[PDB]
């Protein structure tokens, strides 16, 4: 799902092409909305395990105290809400690729257990002493500055240096050249399908604005802007009056 031929993204693609056949852990950083899960899936797709599962553990979408349960599973009655026995994400990912997305959300106690798991594939369901293991290739991602998280004592140093093997620093959208308008056009077609519309072009002022705007929310912000336009309007072309706040006003400062 990567779109873009820009110089810094072609450097990302070279990393992916050369590292994907390895089982080496890839560690992805970049600003919010830069495509870290798309990048992770592209590593999976380029790897020999492309036809096996690609599982993303989205830590910022799981209640913090339940990430362990979601990752490792749990036996019935392990804790107050453990109504059923649960299969962990690690079992879903066996023989495939496991993305630990936004893993700096994990609390220090979970990080201590993760340290075992990433070395051997060994884990226990919450509530149980029984050990199992799985075969997974890791990809990690965070929006945080990992070295700052380690310095402030929020992320384990031993864990970081065993995960941080092949780094990818995704470029922010504002540094991606022709990619902004390439992604915008692809989103215009996708959102047109989603809304039952037919947008395909941008006027010249919109092209200029989108190319120069700093996109502090990166590709998610661009997705939200295109969705806003296609939901609210019906045209073949995006016009400057359609661009939502605060794009124009922030660019003016
Ligand atoms: N290069 C790209 N080309 C096309 N679509 C992209 C690209 N990068 C990201 N996207 C789209 O943007 C959305 C966000 O991607 P992803 O979830 O990979 O981002 P993230 O960096 O993990 O950030 P967020 O934390 O905002 O979710 C997805 O719908 C994805 O398809």
Cα–ligand 1 centroid distance for 129 (angstroms): 38
Same domain, 26 and 117: yes
C-alpha 240/C-alpha 203 separation (Å) is 7
The sign of the CA dihedral 237, 240, 243, 247 is: positive
Same domain, 25 and 44: yes
Cα–ligand 1 centroid distance for 220 (angstroms): 6
Containing structural domain, residue 200: 174-253
Same domain, 128 and 50: yes
Which residue's C-alpha comes closest to atom 23 of ligand 1?
Answer: 33
CA 58 to chain centroid:
8
The sign of the CA dihedral 46, 29, 223, 186 is: negative
Same domain, 130 and 50: yes
Q: Which atom of ligand 1 is nearest to the CA of 38?
A: 18
144 lines ligand 1 (CB under 6 A): no
In the block, tokens 């939901």 appear at 231
Same domain, 187 and 151: no
Q: Where are the beta strands (DSSP E) in the chain?
A: 26-29, 54-58, 73-74, 86-87, 97-101, 122-124, 131-133, 137-142, 166-169, 201-202, 237-238
Written as six digits, the tokens of 78 are 């392990």
Same domain, 188 and 151: no
* Method by which the model was determined: X-ray
Task: Indicate which CATH number applies to the domain containing 228.
Answer: 1.10.8.60
Domain total for the chain? Answer: 2
This structure's resolution (angstroms)?
Answer: 1.5
Same domain, 57 and 132: yes
171 lines ligand 1 (CB under 6 A): no
223 lines ligand 1 (CB under 6 A): yes
- Give which of 45, 18, 15 is closest to 28, Cα–Cα: 15
Of the candidates 173, 188, 211, which is a domain's last residue? Answer: 173
DSSP structural state of residue 228 = H
Same domain, 193 and 87: no
Same domain, 178 and 81: no
Same domain, 146 and 215: no
81 lines ligand 1 (CB under 6 A): no
Q: Which atom of ligand 1 is nearest to the CA of 223?
A: 12
180 lines ligand 1 (CB under 6 A): no
Burial class (CB in 10 A: 0-12, 13-18, 19+), 245: exposed
Same domain, 180 and 229: yes
C-alpha 170/C-alpha 29 separation (Å) is 6
Same domain, 18 and 120: yes
């Amino acid at each position: 799902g990567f779109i873009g031929n820009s110089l810094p993204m072609q450097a990302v693609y070279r990393v992916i092409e050369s590292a994907a056949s390895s089982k080496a852990t890839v560690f992805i950083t970049g600003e919010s909305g830069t495509g870290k899960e798309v990048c992770a899936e592209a590593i999976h797709a380029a790897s020999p395990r492309h036809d096996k599962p690609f599982i993303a553990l989205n830590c910022a979408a799981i209640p913090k105290d339940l990430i362990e349960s979601e990752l490792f599973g749990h036996v019935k009655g392990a804790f107050t809400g453990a109504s059923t026995e649960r299969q962990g994400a690690v079992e879903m990912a066996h023989n495939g690729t496991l993305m630990l997305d936004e893993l700096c959300e994990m609390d220090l106690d979970l990080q201590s257990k993760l340290l075992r798991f990433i070395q051997t594939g060994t884990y226990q369901k919450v509530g149980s002493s029984k050990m199992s293991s799985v075969d997974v290739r890791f990809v990690c991602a965070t929006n945080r500055n990992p070295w700052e998280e380690v310095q402030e004592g929020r992320f384990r140093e031993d864990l970081y240096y065993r995960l941080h093997v092949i780094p990818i620093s995704l470029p922010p959208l504002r540094e991606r050249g022709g990619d902004i308008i390439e992604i915008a056009h692809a989103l215009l077609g996708l959102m047109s399908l989603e809304e039952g519309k037919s947008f395909s072009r941008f006027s010249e002022p919109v092209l200029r604005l989108f190319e120069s705007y700093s996109w502090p929310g990166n590709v998610r912000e661009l997705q939200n802007v295109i969705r806003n336009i296609v939901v609210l309007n019906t045209d073949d072309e995006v016009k400057l009056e359609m661009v939502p706040p605060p794009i124009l006003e922030h660019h003016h400062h």
